[PDB]
Amino acid sequence: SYLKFLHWMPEALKMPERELIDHAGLDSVVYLRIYWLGLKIFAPIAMLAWAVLVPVNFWAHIIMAYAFTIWTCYMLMKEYETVANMRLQFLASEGRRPDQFTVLVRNVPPDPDETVSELVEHFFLVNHPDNYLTHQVVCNANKLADLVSKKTKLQNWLDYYQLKYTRNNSQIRPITKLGCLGLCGQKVDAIEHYIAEVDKTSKEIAEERENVVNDQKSVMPASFVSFKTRWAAAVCAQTTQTRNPTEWLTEWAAEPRDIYWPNLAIPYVSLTVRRLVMNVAFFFLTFFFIIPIAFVQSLATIEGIEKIKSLIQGLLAGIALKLFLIFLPAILMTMSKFEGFTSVSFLERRSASRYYIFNLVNVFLGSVIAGAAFEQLNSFLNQSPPMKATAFITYIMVDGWAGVAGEILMLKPLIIYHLKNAFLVKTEKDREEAMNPGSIGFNTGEPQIQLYFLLGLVYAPVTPMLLPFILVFFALAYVVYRHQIINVYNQEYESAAAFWPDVHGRVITALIISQLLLMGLLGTKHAASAAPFLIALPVITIGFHRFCKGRFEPAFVRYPLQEAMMKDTLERAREPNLNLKGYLQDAYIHPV
Amino acid sequence: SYLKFLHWMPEALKMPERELIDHAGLDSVVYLRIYWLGLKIFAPIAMLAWAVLVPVNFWAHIIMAYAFTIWTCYMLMKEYETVANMRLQFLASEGRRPDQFTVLVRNVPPDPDETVSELVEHFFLVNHPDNYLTHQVVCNANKLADLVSKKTKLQNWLDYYQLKYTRNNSQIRPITKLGCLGLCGQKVDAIEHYIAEVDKTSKEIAEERENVVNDQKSVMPASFVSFKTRWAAAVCAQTTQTRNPTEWLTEWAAEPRDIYWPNLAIPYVSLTVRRLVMNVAFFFLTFFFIIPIAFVQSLATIEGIEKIKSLIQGLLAGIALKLFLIFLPAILMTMSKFEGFTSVSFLERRSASRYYIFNLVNVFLGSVIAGAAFEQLNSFLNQSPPMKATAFITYIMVDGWAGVAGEILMLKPLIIYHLKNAFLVKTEKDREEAMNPGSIGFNTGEPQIQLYFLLGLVYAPVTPMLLPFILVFFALAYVVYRHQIINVYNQEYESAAAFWPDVHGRVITALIISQLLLMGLLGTKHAASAAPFLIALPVITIGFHRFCKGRFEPAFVRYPLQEAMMKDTLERAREPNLNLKGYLQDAYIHPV
């Protein structure tokens, strides 16, 4: 009810900030701070765009430009500070995690007389003698995991179809091989997913289990060398280990509860080849989506012609793309995993980066217009063998405002169940219920924010109306998402705001893009005294970015050796008698 | 005689390469390898430019482009290998130098209760506990050094005028204050530079000596923290020390015999301000020189009109700039020292970088033409209130070929004495004879090579005649400079080919510049199928550069921890009983 809504409202309001840092985490609290920065950049600039623009509506547009960029950059520095400080304070007042002591030594050189392990020990007992504790060679246990997951799949799927009414429960027969027979199959068989399957999978689990342990081919050329101190691991992580820059490549290891175990099986040789392939694939996907949008937009216009109304048209063009990009986030994740990164963090951050480039092109610069122009060129060939502010106003009304409305409705898992019903073999699915929240969304939420930053900063000097709408999104997001951060959303890895460097870059990108585009609208004709004015702005922005990347980014990309020593000494004093070998040895073998 | 010339010739030929690495050094041998790379890039490309160009003289120009760039890049990778390998081998088979164990901790935070030293000890005994050996706080002893140098100046200058004929030797009276009295002065006085001066300088030497030792204001906020092992110092050099990215800034210390002691006295706050100032100054100097060239070129043309002959004109325009840039190297050195770098290496490398940007503009792209065009615009205002291949052919004939001729003539110090005679108070100078060779010249020789690379790679697809001339320079340089490297030129610091990363970048710059310029000559008109062909070349070049910067550059910018441990263990075995405190403590106090 309205009352209940208002109540969750100031309930989420009555919690402090540092209490949330321990209640929810740092990742979540600085992600909530992105919306806050937005409200602290697009609010003052709206006040100025309603005093210089509308009343006096141009050298004032270029003056507004400067003022807007200054405030944006001022606030970005201030927030970089708070987030960097929070990260370093949190890092200190944390707990004990194995990663703090271990490093992944990728690409261990070939040895025709030793196992990878022997070689690793030798190397790290002569190179880091007083601190090397233990090494855990990583094995290719993706096969074991697949069978294990299949076993549970089988069991769960037909636990429903063996206990529904027991006895000879519905002996269904789906496609044994979709390539061979279409529709369904003829294996009525028995219950428990044709029990022989559960049995043979358990037998193959045992099979792989055997091989994995005793084969010396499962273990990849890598290990997770661990050290006695945080200080020592920090040293190893930020130090070159050998003459060959390809072999013995040590980097900070991540939380074991974050390691993407599947990708700890790809050679360092194949990585580069894969990278190229995945690169060009993203390119195609970009241009591709441009076209369905255009065509379905055209459909809408035709329907309207055949049949306020303009607002309705706008909102309908605004959806279509919505379902389309739902399909999109879905994928940006699989593409990163094909490149071959070994940690959830980087995979999620990769997706957000890739999302950015998409949303640049397809959704602002290079969208509707250019794609359709190329299509017209192609149609001519057949025959002879800042976009629109208004449209973005509709996107805010939908995308942003709709997002927060459905977030609070938590109707997202209901729609997941509805897609389950769209797949409907019968009317339902399996007895497996994967409903764990997961992360708030850096692979989804963050791209949204940065795209709205583009829209806002780009159209602020031009149209003074996107700002009021963009602002309300930021405000709503804060309150509804905070409520979730305290009430519903949990976490899956703690990187401690290591993504802020990335966020910063995208706001800086927005700024530069905005200025480059304003040098086009206010460059042609206008004045030859306004163009040089707008030519300095990008340079100033890059300057600020570089300053902030040298004053605040090190807090996210480097672990101060002093901070490590402090943590070590304090923990070695509070708990004078503690063993590390136990906590470290058994943490980096596959979870099989 | 001719015979003697031919003889120094194959004498320099009969020495091996690794024997020269120990005889002369690594710096010198890889600098000699720059000329060799040149001969191995511009020789095959000349053969192709005399088979595709002249016989068939355009899509062949674009084919030649590709082939030339491929060979250049192939050879650059091959040489990066040899130089990286040489560096790592030399580093291993070296001697003991203090730098291998110490790091400069710049920007030590303010302490209202401790001296810089106390603070440094505390920090490095709690942060690097098992390896910290000693710290040597650096003092501002530039004043002491100035008086010391003045004392020697006085003594030496008039040791000539006190022993020429003894007794009351020529009591000369130069300008006591040039601002006050012009020409000369009236202080006939006595011998030994007015002995009272030598006495009062010795008294002021004592004065500063006293203050320096006991004042606690001379010591700057810095120290040269030393460690017990090469491994440990390597760790400290490549590890962030504290949360504040401004304070406690550790970096590898250089050879004490390389430290530019004067600049170890500038605050980390003033550095940035100074940088900006120096930056804009270089800008002015660039454009400035463009103009004298133009005007003196104009003078030459007028003289010719009033009075082969065209060749003579070319060679005369080719000189003028020569004396002008003699004046130039002279300065690029003072500018770096004003920025505030603390080591000869970086100061010399800075000069070479700054020289590059000059020579780009003023000597190829942005030279004669554009400057004079702006001058014509200015003249109109008054009234109403790839350049030329031939010219560069002359530069090779002079600059390059003249350089090597005079190098072998060793008439350079004779010309230094001739400039002494140009200053001539009487006919001679002082009794001080600073004639030590110094370094072969990274601040002078290197800029030359890279400019000739530009000229060559740019004009190879166009004119097939600069290549033969450029080649002979490379060949001559090798033989004449090798002779000097074995017979005359010594060294002043050993960076062990740490400048190759810089060299590489400038050849890559040349490549990219060449391609961009060929997209202009072979872009307009020509074909719309040739422009995209030339658009991929820059990207491929950047790709190769990045590959090589990730495979070979780490050998110059990072010290493998494994190599350090190897060196340590071997030295600790050959000399089982050795003290380090002695060799390390007294090495980083000022040399006063």
Question: Alpha helix locations (H) across A53-167?
Answer: 59-92, 116-126, 142-163
- Tokens coding B145: 């050094």
- Tokens coding A77: 């520095």
CA dist B240 and B242 (Å) reads 6
Per the CB < 8 A criterion, the answer to whether A140 and A219 are in contact is yes
Q: Taking CB atoms and an 8 Å limit, are B562 and A243 in contact across chains?
A: yes
**Shortest Cα distance, chain A CAs vs residue B175, angstroms:** 48
- Tokens coding A521: 């609208």
Q: With beta carbons under 8 A apart, name residues in chain B contacting A107.
A: none
Q: With beta carbons under 8 A apart, name residues in chain B contacting A130.
A: 130
Looking at the DSSP bridge assignments, the partners of residue B38 are none
Looking at the DSSP bridge assignments, the partners of residue B226 are B102, B134
CA dist A248 and A243 (Å) reads 9
Residue A288, phi then psi, degrees to nearest 5:
-55, -60
Q: Taking CB atoms and an 8 Å limit, are A551 and B234 in contact across chains?
A: no
* Chain mean position to CA B398: 22
Q: Which residue of B has its CA nearest to A124?
A: B562
User: Measured between CB atoms, which of A242, A246, A555 is closest to B562?
Assistant: A242
CA dist B146 and B162 (Å) reads 24
Residue A305 CB burial class (10 angstroms; 0-12, 13-18, ≥19):
exposed
Per the CB < 8 A criterion, the answer to whether B162 and B170 are in contact is no
- Tokens coding B302: 């007028």
Of residues A494, A415, A412, the one with CA closest to residue A445? A412
Q: What element of type H or E holds A227?
A: strand A226-227
Q: Which residue of B has its CA nearest to A559?
A: B240
Q: Experimental technique used?
A: cryo-EM
Whole-angstrom CA distances from A213 to A134, A138, A140 are 19, 11, 10
CA dist A396 and A393 (Å) reads 5
Q: Which residues of B319-332 are buried (b: 16+ CB within 10 A; e: fewer)?
A: bbbeeebeebbeeb
Of residues B351, B349, B355, B353, the one with CA closest to residue B334? B351
Q: Taking CB atoms and an 8 Å limit, are B243 and A88 in contact across chains?
A: yes
Phi-psi region of B9 (alpha: psi -120 to 50; beta: other; left: phi over 0): alpha
Residue A153 CB burial class (10 angstroms; 0-12, 13-18, ≥19):
middle
Q: Which residue of B has its CA nearest to A244?
A: B551
- Tokens coding A425: 């073999």
Q: With beta carbons under 8 A apart, name residues in chain B contacting A561.
A: 127-128, 239-242
Please tell me the number of Cα atoms within 13 Å of A250 on its side-chain side. 28
CA dist B555 and B133 (Å) reads 27
**Secondary structure (3-state) at B371:** helix
- Please list the helix, strand and coil fractions of chain A in percent, rounded to the nearest 5, in that order: 65, 5, 30
Residue B214 CB burial class (10 angstroms; 0-12, 13-18, ≥19):
exposed
Residue B222, phi then psi, degrees to nearest 5:
-160, 165
Of residues B15, B88, B68, the one with CA closest to residue B478? B15
Which residue carries 């002369």 as its tokens? B24
Which residue carries 């004396």 as its tokens? B323
Select from B107, B228, B239 the residue whose CB has the most chain A CBs within 10 Å, as the one to mutate to test that interface.
B239
Q: With beta carbons under 8 A apart, name residues in chain A contacting B245.
A: 550-552, 554-555
CA dist A63 and A537 (Å) reads 11
At CB < 8 Å, which residues of chain B contact A? 88, 123, 126-128, 130, 231, 234-235, 238-243, 245-246, 248, 550-552, 554-555, 558-563, 565, 569
Per the CB < 8 A criterion, the answer to whether A541 and A69 are in contact is yes
User: Measured between CB atoms, which of A234, A241, A552 is closest to B239?
Assistant: A234
The identity of residue B456, as a single letter, is G
* Chain mean position to CA A452: 17
At CB < 8 Å, which residues of chain A contact B? 88, 123, 126-128, 130, 231, 234-235, 238-243, 245-246, 248, 550-552, 554-555, 558-563, 565, 569
Which residue carries 């110094």 as its tokens? B438
Q: Which residues of A61-78 are buried (b: 16+ CB within 10 A; e: fewer)?
A: bbebbbbbbebbbebbee
User: Measured between CB atoms, which of B241, B552, B560 is closest to A560?
Assistant: B241
Of residues A504, A517, A499, A505, the one with CA closest to residue A457? A517
Residue B421 CB burial class (10 angstroms; 0-12, 13-18, ≥19):
exposed
User: Measured between CB atoms, which of B243, B550, B569 is closest to A560?
Assistant: B243
Per the CB < 8 A criterion, the answer to whether B237 and B226 are in contact is no
Looking at the DSSP bridge assignments, the partners of residue A106 are A249
Q: With beta carbons under 8 A apart, name residues in chain A contacting B91.
A: none
Q: With beta carbons under 8 A apart, name residues in chain A contacting B120.
A: none
Of residues B108, B134, B121, the one with CA closest to residue B242? B108
CA dist B511 and B515 (Å) reads 6
CA dist A210 and A191 (Å) reads 28
Domain boundaries, chain A: 2-97+291-559, 142-213
Q: With beta carbons under 8 A apart, name residues in chain A contacting B240.
A: 238, 554, 558-561
Of residues B338, B334, B359, B328, the one with CA closest to residue B278? B338
Long-range contacts of B563-568 (CB under 8 A, 24+ apart): B563/A242, B563/A243, B563/B88, B563/B91, B563/B92, B564/B229, B564/B230, B564/B231, B564/B234, B565/A126, B565/A127, B565/B230, B565/B231, B566/B92, B567/B92, B567/B230, B568/B229, B568/B230, B568/B231
B531 contacts: CB under 8 Å, gap ≥ 6? B519, B522, B523
How is residue A108 annotated by DSSP? P
CA dist A279 and B323 (Å) reads 52
Q: Which residue of B has its CA nearest to A248?
A: B562
Interhelix angle B196-213/B142-163, rounded to 10 degrees, is: 160
Q: With beta carbons under 8 A apart, name residues in chain B contacting A563.
A: 242-243
Q: Taking CB atoms and an 8 Å limit, are B245 and A565 in contact across chains?
A: no
Which residue carries 């706080």 as its tokens? B137
Q: What element of type H or E holds A139?
A: strand A137-139
Of residues A95, A98, A254, A145, the one with CA closest to residue A585? A98
Q: Taking CB atoms and an 8 Å limit, are B242 and A123 in contact across chains?
A: no
Q: Which CATH class is domain B103-140+218-252?
A: alpha beta
Count of other CB atoms within 10 angstroms of residue A408: 17
Interhelix angle B230-237/B561-574, rounded to 10 degrees, is: 160
Per the CB < 8 A criterion, the answer to whether A251 and A223 are in contact is no
CA dist A469 and A455 (Å) reads 11
Residue A189, phi then psi, degrees to nearest 5:
45, -135
For chain B, first and last CA: distance in Å? 47
Q: Taking CB atoms and an 8 Å cut-off, how many pairs form between chains A and B?
A: 78
Select from B229, B562, B570 the residue whose CB has the most chain A CBs within 10 Å, as the one to mutate to test that interface.
B562
CA dist A147 and A206 (Å) reads 10
Q: With beta carbons under 8 A apart, name residues in chain B contacting A551.
A: 245-246
Q: Taking CB atoms and an 8 Å limit, are A239 and B234 in contact across chains?
A: yes
Q: Taking CB atoms and an 8 Å limit, are A239 and B238 in contact across chains?
A: yes
**What is the torsion angle, in degrees rounded to the nearest 10, for the CA atoms of residue B127, residue B128, residue B133 and residue B134?**
-30
- Tokens coding A216: 């010396």
Q: Taking CB atoms and an 8 Å limit, are A245 and B88 in contact across chains?
A: no
Determine the longest span between alpha carbons in chain B, in angstroms: 87
Q: Taking CB atoms and an 8 Å limit, are B561 and A243 in contact across chains?
A: no
Q: Taking CB atoms and an 8 Å limit, are B242 and A562 in contact across chains?
A: yes
Q: Taking CB atoms and an 8 Å limit, are B127 and A565 in contact across chains?
A: yes
Phi-psi region of B181 (alpha: psi -120 to 50; beta: other; left: phi over 0): beta
Q: Which residue of A has its CA nearest to B272?
A: A547
- Tokens coding A118: 């022997």
Please tell me the number of Cα atoms within 13 Å of A119 on its side-chain side. 19
Of residues A362, A476, A460, the one with CA closest to residue A48? A460
CA dist A449 and A456 (Å) reads 10
Of residues B391, B401, B417, B395, the one with CA closest to residue B310? B391
Q: Which residue of B has its CA nearest to A122?
A: B562
Looking at the DSSP bridge assignments, the partners of residue A226 are A102, A134
CA dist A121 and A225 (Å) reads 9
Q: With beta carbons under 8 A apart, name residues in chain B contacting A560.
A: 240-243
Q: With beta carbons under 8 A apart, name residues in chain A contacting B242.
A: 560-563
CA dist B41 and B253 (Å) reads 36
CA dist A428 and A177 (Å) reads 21
Q: Which residues of B103-114 are buried (b: 16+ CB within 10 A; e: fewer)?
A: bbbbbbeeeeee
- Tokens coding A154: 């089988």
